[PDB]
UniProtKB/Swiss-Prot annotation, chain B:
PANTHER family: SECY/SEC61-ALPHA FAMILY MEMBER (PTHR10906). The gene is SEC61A1. Residues 54-73, 136-141, 191-237, 307-342, 430-433 are lumenal. It comes from Homo sapiens (Human). The chain crosses the membrane at residues 34-53, 74-93, 115-135, 142-162, 170-190, 238-258, 286-306, 343-363, 409-429, 434-450. Its main location: endoplasmic reticulum. GO terms for molecular function: calcium channel activity; protein transmembrane transporter activity; ribosome binding; signal sequence binding. This is Protein transport protein Sec61 subunit alpha isoform 1. One of its GO terms (biological process) is post-translational protein targeting to membrane, translocation.
Curated annotation (Swiss-Prot), chain C:
This is Protein transport protein Sec61 subunit beta. The SEC61 channel-forming translocon complex consists of channel-forming core components SEC61A1, SEC61B and SEC61G and different auxiliary components such as SEC62 and SEC63. The SEC61 channel associates with the multi-pass translocon (MPT) complex. Interacts with TRAM1. Belongs to the SEC61-beta family. It is linked to Loss-of-function SEC61B variations may cause autosomal dominant polycystic liver disease (PCLD) in patients that lack variations in known causative genes, such as PRKCSH and SEC63. It is found in: Endoplasmic reticulum membrane. The gene is SEC61B. It comes from the Eukaryota. Component of SEC61 channel-forming translocon complex that mediates transport of signal peptide-containing precursor polypeptides across the endoplasmic reticulum (ER). Forms a ribosome receptor and a gated pore in the ER membrane, both functions required for cotranslational translocation of nascent polypeptides. The chain crosses the membrane at residues 7-27. Residues 28-32 are lumenal.
UniProtKB/Swiss-Prot annotation, chain D:
NCBIfam families: secE_euk_arch. Residues 62-67 are extracellular. This is Protein transport protein Sec61 subunit gamma. The chain crosses the membrane at residues 33-61. Its main location: endoplasmic reticulum. One of its GO terms (molecular function) is protein transmembrane transporter activity. The modification N-acetylmethionine is found at residue 1. It comes from Homo sapiens. InterPro entries: Prot_translocase_SecE_dom_sf, Translocase_Sec61-g, Translocase_SecE/Sec61-g. GO terms for cellular component: cytosol; membrane; Sec61 translocon complex; Ssh1 translocon complex. GO terms for biological process: post-translational protein targeting to membrane, translocation; protein targeting to ER. Residues 1-32 are cytoplasmic. It is found in: Endoplasmic reticulum membrane.
From Swiss-Prot, chain E:
The chain holds residues 152 to 201 of 201 of the full protein. Belongs to the FKBP-type PPIase family. It is found in: Membrane. The chain crosses the membrane at residues 5-25. It comes from Homo sapiens (Human). PPIases accelerate the folding of proteins during protein synthesis. Interacts with IFITM5. This is Peptidyl-prolyl cis-trans isomerase FKBP11.
């Protein structure tokens, strides 16, 4: 790793003097998540639709 | 984002009442009694009919009440509340909804989900009145429709309080779980001993299987012919259907015990030994719920799509509707109607069985991550408890759980599916999923009894 | 959001059940 | 069809995993099993009858409440 | 008013009277047992007064 980054991060930390006690601490499948969402939402919506269909 | 919502909803959340904390632990005689009063009041309410039911043929809703539960005050029942709970859990697993670890944030989260269930009840009731299922909205009148909606809404609200009280510790266990178990057991007893006689075109017969046997035996001179009818009468509940049910209970009890226990110790104090148990049915009934929901959802879309575009080849290819899909993938998903049909088309039967087992197993493993019961979550929970495994470092413990947790969830999904398929072919009364709930809830109550006897 | 004792909840529940019976009987009498 | 062959290797291994899990888990003994069977049976009958009677009582009440 | 409302007063007055009796019984049952410790404090002050 480039040694030059030692000085790069040092100046960043120097800036913290102004940002006291507020410094940013840091610096599931997509397909599955969509798949589950329709299953749970679908059951509620479809049950409502089915009830109307059964009466009709 | 969701936390920002929580503050916005915070004024709304406050209105909802909360049950008082029990000041002191309750002795056993008292402990049982609080649940019983709750059970009776709920049971009576379930059967009360509604007001302004209207109905061509007058007294239609009269005949309806004496058969099924359709039209009663508790028709909405538990379905609105459970849907609210499941959706909230899924969002947390997604992380789209953020819940603060601090107790105050979690308490707000509980308030929000209770409120969300209340919203579901209002929407469901309004749809039924608009649909005119009870009767034409114009015929009912504005006053009648408003009153009927009020009746259902209070019915939902009262249920929430009763369930909360059981959780609060006045009564053992959780109210909703007991209520679901109660009807399931009630169904088994009712079919067995119900004295109502229903008139078939050939002749009137008793609903109760045991009652039917006694009556049939005396009436008919030929004992052998009567005996065969009672055991294998298709139209009405069979004697065999009960015997299948008893057999299914025996299997559920034996398997339910299965669990793996891992030694654990408290860091603070020496000599204290506790075991953390992971059950074989670790996922519980959730996988079957998801798989059935998907199949029903697909069926509704497929049948509806056929009507709108009958011509389209794609809709026919997935399913052909006669509503039962005669052919196509949806037809394969459908359970085989009879044992004789299965022999007729073995390939259809094999495809359904293989799919049923696979779907449950896959869903269970995926569910764990969104559920929040994964090994990573379990380890962090122990740290707050200040209890750690004995002989291992904290980081190593996570690996140790990962050895057992994933395998158990996959097997549990397969096992639950296997029972559900088994129940229908035997023909035992009630769903297999219902059977597990009854045994599990009863056994938990039994465990509480053991300490009391001391 | 008021904290409510368990016994108060029981009495409120019973009143609602009683009201429904009263409404049905009132419905027959008002019709008649 | 390449994916199906690739799947076979995972198919076998987890089947092996299931057997190990079965061995580790505690298995309910016969004698304790009897105790559970009585406990569930008593609870099942006692709880079920409460539903049975309340339903029976309601049916005549339904006739009176609505013609 | 008498022919239409009297049945309603019968249905409404009975619950109201039962609530009123229950309230009386609850108030009488809720009589709080005077803390014997405060009574002991009165005894302690009684020895100072003697």
């Amino acid at each position: 790793v480039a040694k030059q980054r030692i000085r790069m991060a040092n100046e960043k930390h120097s800036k913290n003097i102004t940002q006291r006690g507020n410094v940013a601490k840091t610096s599931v499948g997509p397909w599955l998540l969509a798949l589950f969402i329709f299953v749970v939402c679908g059951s509620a919506i479809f049950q409502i639709i089915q009830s109307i269909r059964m009466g009709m | 984002m969701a936390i920002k919502f929580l503050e916005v909803i915070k004024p709304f959340c406050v209105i909802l009442p909360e049950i008082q904390k029990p000041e002191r632990k309750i002795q056993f005689k008292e402990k049982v009694l609080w649940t019983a009063i709750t059970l009776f009041i709920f049971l009576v309410c379930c059967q009360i009919p509604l007001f302004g039911i209207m109905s061509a043929d007058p007294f239609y809703w009269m005949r309806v009440i004496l058969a099924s539960n359709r039209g009663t005050l508790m028709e909405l029942g538990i379905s609105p509340i459970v849907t609210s709970g499941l959706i909230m859990q899924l969002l947390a697993g997604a992380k789209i909804i953020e819940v603060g670890d601090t107790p105050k944030d979690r308490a707000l989260f509980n308030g929000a989900q209770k409120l969300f269930g209340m919203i579901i009840t209002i929407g469901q009731s309004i749809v039924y009145v608009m649909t005119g299922m009870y009767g034409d909205p114009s015929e009912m009148g504005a006053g009648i429709c408003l009153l009927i909606t009020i009746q259902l809404f209070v019915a939902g609200l009262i249920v929430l309080l009763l369930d909360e009280l059981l959780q609060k510790g006045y009564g053992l266990g959780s109210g909703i779980s007991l209520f679901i178990a109660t009807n399931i057991c009630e169904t088994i007893v009712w079919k067995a001993f119900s004295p109502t006689t229903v008139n078939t075109g050939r002749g009137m017969e008793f609903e109760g299987a045991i009652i039917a046997l006694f009556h049939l035996l005396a009436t008919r001179t030929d004992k052998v012919r009567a005996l065969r009818e009672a055991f294998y009468r298709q139209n009405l509940p069979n004697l065999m259907n009960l015997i299948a049910t008893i057999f299914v209970f025996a299997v559920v009890i034996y398997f339910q015990g299965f669990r793996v226990d891992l030694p654990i110790k408290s860091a603070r104090y020496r000599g204290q030994y506790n075991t953390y148990p992971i059950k074989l049915f670790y996922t519980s009934n959730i996988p079957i719920i998801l798989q059935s929901a998907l199949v029903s959802n697909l069926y509704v879309i497929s049948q509806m799509l056929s009507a709108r575009f009958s011509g389209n080849l794609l809709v026919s290819l997935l399913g052909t509707w006669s509503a039962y899909p005669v052919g196509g993938l949806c037809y394969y998903l459908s359970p085989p109607e009879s044992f004789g049909s299965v022999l007729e088309d073995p390939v259809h039967a094999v495809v359904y069985i293989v799919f049923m087992l696979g779907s449950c197993a896959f869903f269970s493993k995926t569910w764990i991550e969104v559920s929040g019961s994964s090994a990573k979550d379990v380890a962090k929970q122990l740290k707050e408890q200040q209890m750690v495994m004995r002989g291992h470092r904290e980081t190593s413990m996570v690996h140790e759980l990962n050895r057992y947790i994933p395998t158990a969830a996959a097997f549990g999904g397969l096992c639950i599916g296997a029972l559900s398929v088994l129940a229908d072919f035997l023909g035992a009364i009630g769903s297999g999923t219902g059977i597990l709930l009854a045994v599990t809830i009863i056994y938990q109550y039994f465990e509480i009894f053991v300490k009391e006897q001391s | 959001g008021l904290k409510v004792g368990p016994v108060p909840v029981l009495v409120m529940s019973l009143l609602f059940i009683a009201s429904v019976f009263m409404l049905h009987i009132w419905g027959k009498y008002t019709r008649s | 069809m390449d994916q199906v062959m690739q799947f076979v290797e995972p198919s076998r291994q987890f089947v092996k995993d299931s057997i190990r899990l079965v061995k580790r888990c505690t298995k309910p003994d016969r004698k304790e099993f009897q105790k559970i069977a009585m406990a569930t049976a008593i609870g099942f009958a006692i709880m079920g009858f409460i539903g049975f009677f309340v339903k029976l009582i309601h049916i005549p009440i339904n006739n009176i409440i609505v013609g | 008013l008498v022919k239409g409302i009297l049945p309603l007063v019968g249905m409404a007055m009975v619950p109201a009277l039962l609530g009123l009796i229950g309230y009386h019984l609850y108030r009488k049952a809720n009589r709080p047992k005077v803390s014997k410790k405060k009574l002991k404090e009165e005894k302690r002050n009684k020895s100072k007064k003697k």
